[PDB]
Structures are given as C-alpha cells and as structure tokens.
Amino acid sequence: MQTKIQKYAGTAMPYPNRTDGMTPFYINHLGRHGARFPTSRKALDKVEKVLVSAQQENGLTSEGMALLSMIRRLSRLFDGQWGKLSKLGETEQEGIAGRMIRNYPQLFSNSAKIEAIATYVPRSINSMDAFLSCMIRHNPALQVQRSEGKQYNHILRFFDLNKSYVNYKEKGDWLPIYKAFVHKKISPVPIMKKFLLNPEQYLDKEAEEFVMALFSVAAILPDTSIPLNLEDLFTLDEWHRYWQTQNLRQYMSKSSAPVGKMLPVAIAWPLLSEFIRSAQEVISGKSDYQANFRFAHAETVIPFVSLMGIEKTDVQVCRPDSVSVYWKDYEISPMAANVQWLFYRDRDQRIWVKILLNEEAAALPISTACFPYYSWEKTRIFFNQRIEMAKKTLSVFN
C-alpha cells in the first residue's frame, strides 16, 4: 500500500498507513519514537558547501541555484530543531495508541494500570507522551506510571553499552563492504549534472559524498511536517539504488549479516529478557499491569526484532547484492516502528501470544495449529534459547 518512493526512504519512511473478538489480558510493547527531524546538520552543510563553492565559481545550473536557495531555507527551518519529534510523529503515536484502545477497549477499561518507559532522548520521551496523552484522553481513569532516563540504558540503549559492538559499528569489517557497494550502485555524474556545470570535473569521492548527502537531506524531509518535498531531485531508479545501499548498511551494522557474526543482534538479549520477565510477572499475578510500553530507537528495534527471530528478519545472507531481496529495513523499522505482544487466556486457562510487527501479525519459526496465535510456553522456551545463544555469541566477542 506504500509507494515505492516512500519505501526507498528506508528507516526514514514515515509509519505506514494502518487505517475476531479475541480480547487480550496484557500487552507488551516496544516502539521507536515517531517521525523526527534530522539529527545532524552534516549532510545539509556538505550540500550547501558544494553549491556555494560552485556559485562563487559560476558553476551552477539554474536548477542548482534553485537547489541552493531551497537548501538555505531548510537550514533556517531546521535551526534549533535537530532531532525533535515532529507533528507527524506525534500523530503517528496517537494513531498507534488509538487503534490499540479501539481494538481492545476492555483491556484499558475502568481502572486498568499501564506503565511506560523511555530513553533519555527527548524525541522518545515526547513520543511516550503523545502516546500516553491519547490513552488518558480515551480513559482518564487509567493508572499510569511514567518514567524515563539513563537507568534504562541497559535494556533500551544496549547498542551504546557493549564495547565490542561499538567498535564493530565504528570500524568493523562491514565498512569496506558497504563502501564498495555504494561505489557500485551510485553514479553521481547524472545527478550532479542537473545542478552543476562540468560535473565530470569532480573527483569520484567528492561527487559521491555530495550525492549521498543530498539523498539524506531528501529522505528525511517527509518526516518533518514541513510542506516541502525533494523526491524529484532523483529518478525512481536512483532512489532504488540509494535505498539498496542504506538497507545494506542497516543490515550489516545493526542486524544478522554474516559479517557481523550475530554480534549486532546478540546485544539485544537484555530487552528480550525484560519482555519475558514482565509478561511472566503479569501471568503469575505478581504484577497486575495491563500493559507495558517502552519508547526508544531504530537501534533498539532492529536487533530486538532479529533476536526474536520474527519472519526472516534474522536471515544471514552471504551475498551483499542479495540482501535487499530477503531483508527490508522499511518493513522492520520505519518511523514509529513498534512490536506488540498480545497475551490471551482461553477457556481452559491456556495462555496464547500474538506478535505484531508494525501492527501486522508476525510469524515465528515454531509451529501452531491456530496462526497467528502461538503457545506462550513454546514461545517462551524458544525466546529463552535465543537469549542463551545471544549470551554465547557475546562471550566470544567479549
């Protein structure tokens, strides 16, 4: 239902459009913050610098002059706004919250209790608040515990706390593979021709950096609620190629790529452990929360989803050029990406669990006679094995 052009924004794609009587007794949630502003001015500055230099040397086409003017505008509009949750992101959360309460009103009825946590990052806290405000508007009699901060780094920001992973992310063996893939997929000259006279005068490296920075600026704009669009700076095929390179970057640096040896995935086990613990506590009656919500990041969601072993999000593809066929970032971690575990009790008091990834039922590599419902016992056992495997992985890269 999403357009190809939307998809090619990858993890910058805005949350997609989501507009049997089974009623769950508990929901276990993890969501990325909603649509945000760019976090860094680096790409913008790079584009501006190249254009200003060309302008001083009379090297701009008319379209280039136009682009420069537009780039200066964005610089003004982004000023002081870096990394913030946009109006669109607030509305994404309201929609997710709203569909949840509409789908399962009994769960949030009367004096139901919910807890929410977030990282210390403002856009995640603001996302939590957009979400909680909706819940409370629908049922003010909810009891709500709201907390956030670095105390949750171990479960929400594990990607900052593992030294081996940090090193891998910064300078691991995925880097040269990514760089060569970009060199193969991205042809800067046709693009820069649009904006600059004598584009063939540019060194391949400066030309590539310019084009890559430009894609980055274009890709984030639909997340900002600013009524400006730059999708037409590039052809559909150029977007497709850009998307392939960034998709590979995400897969290799944050997911199940063989070059990563599952290190990027294994680091998420504390969050999977926490999910199981909170569900177990509700199930036993030690806790009587109706839902636990958690607000964090793409860097939280991607490895978490792979560690769960959902669908083929943990596929290990040897061939870089085959990755995009089997693993798609925009399907896993768009803006506002979320995972929900819905728990049910049947008439025989047996506990079942449904996993939703971006509000669509997800499959696990275990059997069930009633998909999309899985036996909680089987599921927990499976997840506990994933955690054990994760610890084993980390013990080798310690």
Residue numbers in the entry: 20 to 38, 46 to 424
Give verbatim excerpts from the published study on this entry:
The crystal structure (diffraction data were collected on beamlines I02 and I24 at the Diamond Light Source, UK) of BtMinpp expressed in Escherichia coli as an N-terminal 6 × His fusion protein was solved at pH 5.0 by SAD using phases from a selenomethionyl derivative. Refinement against native data at 1.93 Å resolution gave a final structural model with an Rcryst of 16.6% (Rfree 21.3%) and excellent geometry. A single inorganic phosphate group is bound at the active sites of both molecular copies of BtMinpp in the crystallographic asymmetric unit, presumably scavenged from the phosphate buffer used during purification of the enzyme. Comparison of the structures of analog- and phosphate-bound forms revealed an rmsd of 0.20 Å for Cα atoms suggesting limited conformational changes occur between the two states. Moreover, we rationalize the catalytic activity and evolutionary conservation of BtMinpp by mutagenic studies and by an atomic-level description of the structure of this enzyme at 1.9 Å resolution.
We determined that prominent gut bacteria express homologs of the mammalian InsP6 phosphatase (MINPP) and characterized the enzyme from Bacteroides thetaiotaomicron (BtMinpp). The Vmax value for InsP6 (178 μmol/mg/min) is the highest yet reported for any member of the MINPP family, being several orders of magnitude greater than that for the human (0.006 μmol/mg/min) and avian (0.7 μmol/mg/min) representatives (Ali et al., 1995, Cho et al., 2006). BtMinpp folds into two domains, an α/β domain and an α domain. The active site in BtMinpp is lined with predominantly basic amino acids, thereby rationalizing how the enzyme can bind unusually highly phosphorylated substrates such as InsP6.
